[PDB]
Every structure is written in structure tokens, then in C-alpha cells.
Amino acid sequence: MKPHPWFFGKIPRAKAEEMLSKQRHDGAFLIRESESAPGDFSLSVKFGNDVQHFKVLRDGAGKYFLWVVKFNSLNELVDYHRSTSVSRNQQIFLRDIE
Amino acid sequence: GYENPTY
């Protein structure tokens, strides 16, 4: 296999926004390790002239999720949202950064 | 904050 181009580690929320604001297409995203919740992950996505942030939650069994559907890994959560919108307000499909 | 309610 090859590594994933979307894991940025501990990049500040502000820097994620600065980086994603420069992206060409809506849906461009990255997964970052939260600085507010040690051990927690956040999903940053470009949409128009904004950058939306989604908190990656974990249920009682340790599965990850954003809304209702649960995933056994960040990898599956990410791939799922390439075909299903991450947003409740508009259609936003995840696309790898350029 | 985040787009998805966190609690």
C-alpha cells in the first residue's frame, strides 16, 4: 500500500484553514489531531470561501463517527464521505487535496 | 466550534 495524503498530524486549526483556503475544489480536506482534545481528531474541509470543521466522535465501542453511521477506522469514515456528504446543510463530498 | 453537534 501507500500512505494517505490526508493525515496531517498535529497541525493547528488555524493553519489547516490557511492551507485548505488555498485549495481549488470544495471538499478538499485533511484529518488533523485536535489541540483542544488530546487524542481526538478533527476533519477540516474546504467549501467556498470558508473551511468547515467536523469533530470526529467515538462511541462506547470505540468506533468513529460524525453523525449517525459508525466506522471502525478514520480510513473508512473518510472513504465513506467521498460518496456521502459530510454536511447536513449542503452537499460536500470529500476530495483529496492537490 | 464544529459543524456537527459534539455531545
Helix content of chain B: under 10%
CATH topology of chain A: SHC Adaptor Protein
**Structural class, judged by helices and strands of chain A?**
alpha+beta
**Beta-strand residue fraction of chain B:** under 5%
| Shape designation of chain B | flat
Question: If classified by CATH, what would the architecture of chain A be?
Answer: 2-Layer Sandwich
Shape of chain A: globular
PDB class: protein binding
Keywords: Protein-peptide complex, aicd, Grb2-SH2, protein binding, alzheimer'S disease, APP
Assembly: dimeric
Entry title: Structures of Grb2-SH2 Domain and AICD peptide Complexes Reveal a Conformational Switch and Their Functional Implications.
Lay out the secondary structure.
The complex is a heterodimer of chains A (98) and B (7).
Chain A lengths: L12 H9 L7 E5 L7 E7 L2 E9 L5 E2 L8 H7 L18
Antiparallel strand pairs in A: 1-2, 2-3, 3-4
Chain B lengths: L7
Q: How would you sum up this structure, described in words?
A:
The complex is a heterodimer of chains A (98) and B (7). Chain A is of the alpha+beta class. Chain A has one domain (1-98): SH2 domain (SHC Adaptor Protein). Helices cover 16% and strands 23% of the residues of chain A. Chain A has 2 helices and 4 strands. Chain A has helices at residues 13-21, 74-80; strands at 29-33, 41-47, 50-58, 64-65. In chain A, strands 1-2-3-4 form a 4-stranded antiparallel sheet. In chain A, a hairpin with a 7-residue loop joins strand 1 and strand 2. Chain A is globular. Chain B has 7 residues and is mostly loops. Chain B has no helices and no strands. The N and C termini of chain B lie far apart (12 Å). At the A-B interface, strand 3 of A face loops of B.
